[PDB]
Amino acid sequence: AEYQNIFSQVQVRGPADLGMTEDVNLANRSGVGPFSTLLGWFGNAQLGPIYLGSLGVLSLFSGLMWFFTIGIWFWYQAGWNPAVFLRDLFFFSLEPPAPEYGLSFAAPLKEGGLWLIASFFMFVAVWSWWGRTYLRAQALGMGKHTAWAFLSAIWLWMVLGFIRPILMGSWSEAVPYGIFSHLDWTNNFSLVHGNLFYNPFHGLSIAFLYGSALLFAMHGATILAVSRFGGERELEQIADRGTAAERAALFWRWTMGFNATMEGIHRWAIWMAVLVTLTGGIGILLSGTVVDNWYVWGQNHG
Amino acid sequence: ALLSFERKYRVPGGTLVGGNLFDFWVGPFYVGFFGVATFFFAALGIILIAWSAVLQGTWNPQLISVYPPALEYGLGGAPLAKGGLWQIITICATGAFVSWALREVEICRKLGIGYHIPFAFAFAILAYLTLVLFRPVMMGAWGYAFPYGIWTHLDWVSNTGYTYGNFHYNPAHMIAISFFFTNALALALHGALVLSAANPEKGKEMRTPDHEDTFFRDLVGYSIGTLGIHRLGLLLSLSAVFFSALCMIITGTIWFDQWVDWWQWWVKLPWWANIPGGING
Amino acid sequence: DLASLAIYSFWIFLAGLIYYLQTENMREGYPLENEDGTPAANQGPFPLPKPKTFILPHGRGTLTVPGPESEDRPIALARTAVSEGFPHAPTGDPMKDGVGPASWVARRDLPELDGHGHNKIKPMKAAAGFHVSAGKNPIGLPVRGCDLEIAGKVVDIWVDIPEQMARFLEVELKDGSTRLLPMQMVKVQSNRVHVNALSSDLFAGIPTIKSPTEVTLLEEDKICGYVAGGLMYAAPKRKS
Ligand code: BCL
Ligand code: BCL
Ligand code: BCL
Ligand code: BCL
Ligand SMILES: CC[C@H]1c2cc3[nH]c4c(c3C)C(=O)[C@H](C(=O)OC)c4c3nc(cc4[nH]c(cc(n2)[C@@H]1C)c(C(C)=O)c4C)[C@@H](C)[C@@H]3CCC(=O)OC/C=C(\C)CCC[C@H](C)CCC[C@H](C)CCCC(C)C
Ligand SMILES: CC[C@H]1c2cc3[nH]c4c(c3C)C(=O)[C@H](C(=O)OC)c4c3nc(cc4[nH]c(cc(n2)[C@@H]1C)c(C(C)=O)c4C)[C@@H](C)[C@@H]3CCC(=O)OC/C=C(\C)CCC[C@H](C)CCC[C@H](C)CCCC(C)C
Ligand SMILES: COC(C)(C)C/C=C/C(C)=C/C=C/C(C)=C/C=C/C(C)=C/C=C\C=C(C)\C=C\C=C(/C)CC/C=C(\C)CCC=C(C)C
Ligand SMILES: COC1=C(OC)C(=O)C(C/C=C(\C)CCC=C(C)C)=C(C)C1=O
Ligand SMILES: CCCCCCCCCCCC[N+](C)(C)[O-]
Ligand SMILES: CCCCCCCCCCCC[N+](C)(C)[O-]
Ligand SMILES: CCCCCCCCCCCC[N+](C)(C)[O-]
Ligand SMILES: CCCCCCCCCCCC[N+](C)(C)[O-]
Ligand SMILES: CCCCCCCCCCCC[N+](C)(C)[O-]
Ligand SMILES: CCCCCCCCCCCC[N+](C)(C)[O-]
Ligand SMILES: [Fe+3]
């Protein structure tokens, strides 16, 4: 047995690492969390610090409110009975207003009002969390790639819960909050739109989702295969190509006849991933607004 | 024909079969015994597909489809025009995939790198094999395998899924999907993180891995680190495929009813089965 | 219709994206060369992108890519055939010459630096206050090669300060000098460290470092290249 670098053989620790300062407001950083030897077999042992700040508090409070608004409704559906709450956990569902209320905020609490309140809290939680991915990169002088990528996930989310419902003319089109109910919603959305398999944007989205697993399997495996030459030090291999980066490239050139660079693989990566939700959100946004039935549309090739 | 740094690595050695017989390249492509095997298996397979197209009577890539033997054939041979071509194309495909992996191993040995890549690829081959070989055999017929056609393979996914109701309820499928989604999330984040460090704000110096750890700790209170993230993406994506093969190998064999009903075991637990209220009483 | 327009637009966007991505991935190693080092006639259908410049921290300069490519070192190999596409045989000892799986790149002969400007990699003894935190401690263990002979003993671990991980084992040889062995190329066991890549007689030949408490990018490449190279070139003396 050769050692494969999936798990570390020896962990080492030194003073808690408090991180780079740059332009970060240091008053807003926690202290370090505990150290997890368990985590440390696979990644870093250190927990924290984390950055708080006002936006952070807002986003966290708001996200909790979303979670608790759904949970209170669940307890209510359970008739306050702990045992029924656990028994039926995956079956509960906070549902959006009925079609008859359109886009208005006039539905009663028990029939959509609560869904809107949960949704409101989710909206501010996600957007202020997006603000945070931008601002944490900014304070460190880093590029904005994370916020740009998050925006692509946010796009599908916004389409499903907000943009598409507004374009369709009612909140009843949005997704319910519930484990099983969200899956039923998903199945039903496809059935009602003549089978998503005929939506070319759904197919593209799959190509990318599979493509992400292909790519991360390739990349992850490559870096590990060249970790015996310092491969995972990607930033310094970018600045000063080593034999790691060359053996990596050549593996692929010899196998399939082209290859990446140490920087460029990460560009293939970011785009393979964000295109899942970019094509995805388009496919959904067009569904029912422009195209009622993908099978039908496909028969006219468009 | 060579990358600027390439010549020093093109030495003899590393082959698994044939000594120096096939130890050479064609343009950028390494050959080896398994390069020859891949070409042979792939070439045959493609020729048989084109033959299958002629017997189906079309050349449209959106229409060409090669269907497995119908269920009545069980696990035996079929006339070529009625499933036999599928059977042979499948042997060809398997030979090509395995050959491709073994050729990857040869490249690894020449380059003095770890075998992680062909190892990961073997998971994909194992998923393919689950659908065309293992599942059909356990279920007693080739006909349960998917057909080779762009749109017809999708018909198969749909019909196979709806056979069990909403396939969403397969719990192994749920784990699989989670790994897929988590993998794409991690890929977006790895790519963005490295790029944000290598391409900082205008006029600033390249950030370091320290900044990468710092960014993630600031953001969520943890950073897995640069070795960790490549371990992670490898784990997430291989686990997705592992659970994918799991979720199908158990469908039509150990479980074959509507997957939604599987979940009743939890609801019917004695301590709470009969308490009224909620959704299920 | 609007969906038709969107899908057609998307394919055009995606063609442009692949174009962008492929050319971004040609910032190193291009233009292509013949086996003798001269520009190949066929460069393919993608042209080199406009150069970009990375500003390196700590006054280390910049990197501009694409730029003039050269190996900056002698390559002890020779053709084995009269046409393109065949292997190139080592002219000497491939381990000592640093070719094939023993290759190294002419990286900067300076240490990698952390975000503070300190040496990224330090022997643990000089790293305050780093210690083994889990797993078997290799320090003190005899070191065995693929010939099943003892080649020396572990006298320290070289650790990555900012990332808190083990990077090399420092191994002392019969003559009292040390060598670095990459962490990924050793097997820590209860009574030994085992090194499959190298027979015991090849340890003396590991590239030495010039300062005993730091290691340069160039030195790392030569050490890692040399140890990996043993998989192929120590094969006659192995044995497991
Ligand atoms: C994409 C098309 C459909 C849909 C189709 C599917 C399908 C199909 C599946 C899921 C599954 C998941 N979906 Mg969904 N999903 C959609 C919308 C989303 C949205 C959203 C838009 O905000 C959310 C929060 C969820 C989240 C959920 C998770 C419960 C689950 C795992 C996701 C994951 O690995 O993420 C990435 C991983 C993370 C690091 C973060 C996620 C962590 C989870 C646990 C948090 C989600 C909500 C949370 C409150 C659940 C708490 C559980 C109990 C109440 C204690 N879905 C849309 C509407 N989803 C899978 C499942 O197992 O369902 C049961 C599954 O098979
Ligand atoms: C994996 C689970 C299901 C299934 C689920 C679905 C679903 C659902 C969808 C697809 C779709 C795809 N599937 Mg399928 N698919 C199956 C397994 C297969 C197998 C196989 C095991 O050999 C293959 C080759 C394909 C390939 C195809 C592509 C035509 C299409 C894009 C996939 C992709 O980008 O992947 C990611 C990998 C890459 C990005 C690498 C690129 C390689 C691709 C482009 C290979 C194309 C080869 C194809 C034309 C076969 C011809 C081979 C020649 C004869 C040599 N599927 C099984 C039965 N597949 C999507 C589609 O739009 O179909 C119309 C889609 O919505
Ligand atoms: C029976 C079901 C239908 C079907 C109906 C649907 C529907 C409906 C949809 C998809 C969608 C998709 N389907 Mg489909 N799907 C089917 C068949 C399949 C098959 C297959 C048969 O093998 C596959 C592989 C897929 C593949 C997929 C994905 C490519 C795609 C969603 C990607 C994604 O990452 O979303 C997951 C990511 C998100 C949901 C975005 C997350 C957003 C962020 C902001 C959420 C954060 C929330 C946070 C507050 C929660 C915090 C909790 C934590 C604990 C912290 N489908 C069949 C035909 N499919 C989606 C799509 O885009 O379609 C075009 C979609 O809406
Ligand atoms: C209506 C249909 C049902 C459905 C029915 C099924 C069925 C049926 C199946 C899945 C399976 C999948 N489903 Mg489902 N499922 C649906 C809803 C979804 C949704 C969703 C958001 O609603 C999602 C995300 C998913 C996602 C999942 C994945 C876990 C899994 C597919 C990936 C895979 O197996 O890869 C594994 C990878 C491969 C098989 C590819 C291997 C390719 C390699 C070896 C060779 C190819 C190379 C060559 C041909 C290329 C040519 C060379 C050129 C030069 C390129 N399903 C709905 C409810 N689902 C499938 C599965 O798990 O299979 C194991 C499956 O069979
Ligand atoms: C490009 C496509 C993929 C993608 C990318 C993506 N997602 C993103 C981003 C990116 C680039 C991140 O920047 C952002 C992130 O910060 O990641 C770490 C994120 C993110 N995607 C997330 C989840 C997610 N992404 C999804 C997937 C995808 N995202 C696609 C596959 C999905 C799926 C597949 O359904 C999920 C569920 C989050 C981890 C994060 C967004 C975080 C967020 O918006 O937070 C708002 C809400 C809160 C702040 C708290 C919510 C409430 C919780 C339910 C409470 C439970 C825990 C609590 C925090 C404990 C606190 C205790 C206290 C009392 C002390
Ligand atoms: C296991 C995690 C993920 C993964 C990993 C993975 N895939 C891999 C590898 C790895 C690490 C590579 O090393 C290898 C590669 O070289 O990548 C470029 C590869 C690879 N994965 C590929 C495709 C692929 N992988 C897939 C998925 C996955 N691969 C998982 C998501 C998918 C999906 C999701 O559908 C596809 C389509 C290729 C790009 C490549 C393998 C190339 C190869 O084996 O070539 C040899 C044979 C040929 C050139 C073609 C032979 C043709 C046949 C004889 C006839 C065709 C028959 C076929 C069955 C018909 C199908 C028709 C369809 C309409 C269904
Ligand atoms: C133990 O008990 C307690 C109470 C302590 C805790 C228990 C809590 C529990 C059990 C919570 C369970 C949560 C669950 C199951 C949630 C699952 C939700 C899922 C699966 C979500 C999936 C889809 C979500 C989408 C797509 C929603 C998107 C929302 C938007 C895009 C927001 C749109 C904004 C609207 C409609 C408001 C408009 C207002 C203005 C003016 C901006
Ligand atoms: C080279 O950089 C890489 C790391 O090393 C510094 C990481 O740390 C991470 C961050 C990964 C973590 C910890 C995700 C866990 C959090 C959630 C909510 C899923 C990424 C993306 C990365 O690219
Ligand atoms: C997605 C990963 C989330 C991990 C969250 C870990 C939180 C660690 C925060 C450290 C704060 C600990 N404490 C109490 C010392 O401040
Ligand atoms: C995804 C992070 C969770 C990591 C937990 C996994 C722990 C595996 C421990 C590996 C065993 C180490 N050992 C004994 C071989 O040295
Ligand atoms: C980052 C770029 C990688 C390119 C991926 C190529 C995807 C081709 C798959 C075709 C999808 C078919 N269709 C009809 C649904 O559009
Ligand atoms: C979507 C798959 C399309 C097949 C083409 C894949 C790209 C392979 C690289 C072409 C190699 C040409 N080369 C380098 C020999 O000149
Ligand atoms: C969406 C991921 C959110 C991760 C947030 C983790 C919460 C940890 C909060 C730590 C509390 C800080 N403090 C100073 C009170 O100790
Ligand atoms: C979906 C990804 C498509 C992959 C094909 C992109 C490039 C293929 C071959 C690139 C050319 C290599 N070359 C000639 C520049 O050396
Ligand atoms: Fe990487």
Side-chain angles (χ1 to χ4, degrees):
Chain A
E2 290 172 46
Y3 166 66
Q4 301 304 320
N5 212 20
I6 312 298
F7 298 111
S8 302
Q9 304 174 81
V10 185
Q11 306 192 33
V12 286
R13 192 179 300 161
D17 195 324
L18 300 198
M20 296 302 307
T21 296
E22 300 297 342
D23 286 320
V24 177
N25 185 346
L26 288 184
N28 290 335
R29 277 189 187 153
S30 91
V32 292
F35 281 80
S36 167
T37 285
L38 174 77
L39 252 35
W41 295 113
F42 194 72
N44 284 331
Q46 174 176 320
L47 273 288
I50 187 168
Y51 191 84
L52 295 334
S54 316
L55 242 218
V57 164
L58 172 60
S59 183
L60 179 75
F61 163 78
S62 195
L64 286 185
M65 283 313 284
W66 166 72
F67 184 70
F68 290 143
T69 298
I70 294 155
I72 254 88
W73 175 254
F74 278 17
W75 278 104
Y76 173 75
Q77 288 205 119
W80 316 101
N81 190 331
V84 165
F85 179 90
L86 294 198
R87 181 195 69 211
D88 279 0
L89 192 57
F90 294 173
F91 292 81
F92 303 120
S93 178
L94 176 52
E95 300 275 337
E100 291 88 26
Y101 294 98
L103 288 170
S104 102
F105 301 84
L109 285 195
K110 268 160 187 116
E111 319 175 276
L114 231 16
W115 178 91
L116 285 165
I117 298 171
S119 293
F120 170 82
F121 280 126
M122 202 198 192
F123 189 95
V124 350
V126 165
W127 280 111
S128 72
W129 190 266
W130 174 80
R132 172 171 171 101
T133 55
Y134 192 94
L135 293 165
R136 302 299 91 233
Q138 178 177 270
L140 291 159
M142 302 170 86
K144 296 315 167 297
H145 302 72
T146 297
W148 280 178
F150 189 19
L151 200 57
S152 172
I154 285 161
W155 163 246
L156 177 59
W157 165 77
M158 281 288 285
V159 163
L160 292 158
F162 188 87
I163 309 164
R164 194 186 164 272
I166 285 163
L167 288 188
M168 295 299 288
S170 69
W171 299 124
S172 67
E173 294 290 339
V175 183
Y177 305 114
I179 304 301
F180 289 166
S181 56
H182 105 287
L183 308 172
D184 302 331
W185 185 95
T186 299
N187 173 239
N188 187 252
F189 190 102
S190 179
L191 260 11
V192 144
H193 298 276
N195 193 350
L196 276 190
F197 284 161
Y198 291 118
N199 180 169
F201 286 101
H202 185 261
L204 245 12
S205 197
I206 284 154
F208 296 117
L209 183 70
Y210 291 175
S212 300
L214 173 51
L215 195 48
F216 222 159
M218 283 166 71
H219 180 52
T222 293
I223 298 304
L224 296 180
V226 303
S227 64
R228 64 183 65 175
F229 317 104
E232 77 280 17
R233 291 144 74 182
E234 297 186 307
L235 284 177
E236 193 76 22
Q237 290 270 330
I238 288 171
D240 187 11
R241 190 183 73 236
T243 187
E246 292 180 1
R247 302 175 193 228
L250 286 177
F251 175 89
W252 291 108
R253 179 157 209 94
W254 299 352
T255 293
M256 51 169 187
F258 69 114
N259 56 263
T261 59
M262 197 61 87
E263 191 198 0
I265 197 40
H266 296 93
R267 291 189 188 272
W268 282 109
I270 196 177
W271 279 101
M272 183 65 89
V274 312
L275 285 166
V276 167
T277 47
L278 279 159
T279 57
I282 289 158
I284 299 308
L285 178 68
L286 291 171
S287 286
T289 54
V290 169
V291 177
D292 283 333
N293 183 304
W294 289 103
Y295 175 73
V296 167
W297 183 91
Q299 281 286 321
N300 299 307
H301 258 1
Chain B
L2 266 65
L3 292 182
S4 85
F5 48 77
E6 173 164 1
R7 203 211 177 174
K8 53 180 184 308
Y9 301 100
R10 289 209 180 190
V11 294
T15 66
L16 259 1
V17 163
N20 54 216
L21 239 185
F22 307 99
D23 196 7
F24 59 78
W25 293 252
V26 172
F29 297 107
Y30 181 67
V31 175
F33 177 74
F34 301 100
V36 178
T38 298
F39 177 87
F40 165 80
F41 283 128
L44 222 203
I46 288 150
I47 280 160
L48 294 174
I49 289 163
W51 193 16
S52 189
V54 157
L55 305 168
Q56 191 184 358
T58 185
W59 284 115
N60 197 292
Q62 299 203 89
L63 301 174
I64 293 140
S65 183
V66 184
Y67 310 84
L71 298 181
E72 354 135 16
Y73 288 95
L75 295 173
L80 266 29
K82 292 133 135 327
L85 277 166
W86 184 95
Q87 290 183 304
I88 296 168
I89 297 172
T90 293
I91 292 156
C92 287
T94 299
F97 303 159
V98 171
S99 295
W100 191 268
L102 253 5
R103 166 177 177 258
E104 284 183 349
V105 168
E106 277 190 343
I107 295 169
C108 289
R109 280 148 76 73
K110 197 191 280 310
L111 281 173
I113 73 179
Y115 295 137
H116 306 59
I117 299 153
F119 181 87
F121 178 41
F123 283 64
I125 293 180
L126 253 19
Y128 164 75
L129 252 22
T130 290
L131 304 174
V132 300
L133 173 58
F134 307 143
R135 197 178 167 261
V137 152
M138 273 180 90
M139 278 182 77
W142 301 121
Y144 293 116
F146 64 96
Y148 305 144
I150 275 139
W151 294 108
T152 59
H153 98 293
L154 264 52
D155 295 340
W156 179 98
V157 174
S158 213
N159 295 152
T160 304
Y162 282 115
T163 297
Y164 310 92
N166 180 352
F167 207 75
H168 286 158
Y169 285 94
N170 179 154
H173 188 261
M174 280 175 182
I175 292 166
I177 287 188
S178 286
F179 277 120
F180 280 108
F181 283 173
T182 302
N183 179 262
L185 164 58
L187 190 65
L189 293 167
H190 178 61
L193 191 52
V194 175
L195 293 172
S196 67
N199 300 275
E201 274 170 357
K202 209 196 183 142
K204 290 200 146 75
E205 312 159 301
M206 282 182 84
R207 258 90 273 254
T208 59
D210 328 18
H211 295 83
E212 285 176 314
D213 282 341
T214 296
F215 169 83
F216 241 78
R217 287 161 178 161
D218 274 342
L219 182 70
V220 303
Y222 178 70
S223 166
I224 203 169
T226 64
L227 178 55
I229 189 63
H230 296 97
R231 272 147 173 200
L232 185 60
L234 184 60
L235 187 100
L236 293 174
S237 86
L238 295 188
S239 284
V241 166
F242 174 86
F243 277 104
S244 285
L246 217 228
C247 98
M248 288 308 287
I249 196 58
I250 70 182
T251 288
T253 64
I254 87 183
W255 179 273
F256 53 73
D257 304 297
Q258 309 282 283
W259 273 112
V260 63
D261 297 316
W262 181 87
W263 291 83
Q264 277 182 220
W265 78 258
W266 173 268
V267 176
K268 283 350 194 185
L269 288 164
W271 1 309
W272 57 42
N274 297 304
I275 315 190
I279 308 303
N280 292 317
Chain C
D1 98 291
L2 219 312
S4 264
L5 165 76
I7 191 69
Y8 172 85
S9 305
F10 175 85
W11 281 107
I12 290 164
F13 156 86
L14 182 66
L17 180 68
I18 288 163
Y19 186 78
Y20 163 82
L21 285 163
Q22 187 47 34
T23 56
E24 282 306 309
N25 281 266
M26 291 162 73
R27 297 189 182 268
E28 304 245 10
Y30 284 78
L32 304 182
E33 293 184 2
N34 305 300
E35 316 187 335
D36 58 17
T38 58
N42 197 4
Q43 288 308 316
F46 302 98
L48 299 187
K50 294 176 148 48
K52 76 193 274 176
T53 297
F54 292 102
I55 308 175
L56 311 178
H58 322 295
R60 295 275 182 94
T62 60
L63 167 80
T64 294
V65 281
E69 286 293 358
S70 64
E71 293 296 83
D72 301 340
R73 43 149 319 187
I75 303 314
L77 293 176
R79 272 220 163 154
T80 61
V82 306
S83 40
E84 291 247 313
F86 283 87
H88 300 89
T91 52
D93 183 325
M95 298 287 282
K96 307 199 168 114
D97 296 343
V99 299
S103 288
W104 53 267
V105 171
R107 309 191 77 203
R108 229 130 156 24
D109 198 10
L110 289 167
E112 185 170 356
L113 296 182
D114 62 27
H116 276 102
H118 303 300
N119 290 359
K120 173 147 173 87
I121 303 176
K122 254 157 211 205
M124 195 172 62
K125 97 184 9 101
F130 272 76
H131 55 279
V132 173
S133 62
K136 167 63 150 171
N137 193 330
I139 294 160
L141 288 184
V143 175
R144 196 183 53 175
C146 69
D147 62 342
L148 306 187
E149 299 299 330
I150 298 317
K153 59 161 256 238
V154 180
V155 298
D156 204 356
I157 301 164
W158 285 50
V159 304
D160 191 308
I161 281 86
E163 301 195 75
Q164 319 216 357
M165 67 168 279
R167 290 251 179 232
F168 300 84
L169 295 193
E170 185 174 349
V171 174
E172 179 173 313
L173 312 183
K174 248 197 116 213
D175 71 355
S177 65
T178 65
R179 300 296 189 273
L180 299 194
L181 277 295
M183 216 42 239
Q184 314 79 356
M185 299 293 288
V186 305
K187 172 52 81 150
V188 192
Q189 310 190 277
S190 71
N191 59 340
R192 82 171 66 80
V193 170
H194 189 82
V195 190
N196 172 62
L198 294 182
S199 54
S200 57
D201 58 303
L202 294 181
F203 276 68
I206 303 163
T208 57
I209 57 169
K210 90 239 208 260
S211 307
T213 58
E214 73 174 35
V215 56
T216 65
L217 297 186
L218 178 61
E219 292 168 335
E220 290 192 62
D221 244 48
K222 296 183 171 176
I223 290 155
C224 302
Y226 179 93
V227 182
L231 297 164
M232 181 184 283
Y233 300 120
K237 331 119 187 278
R238 167 199 309 119
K239 218 141 150 188
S240 44

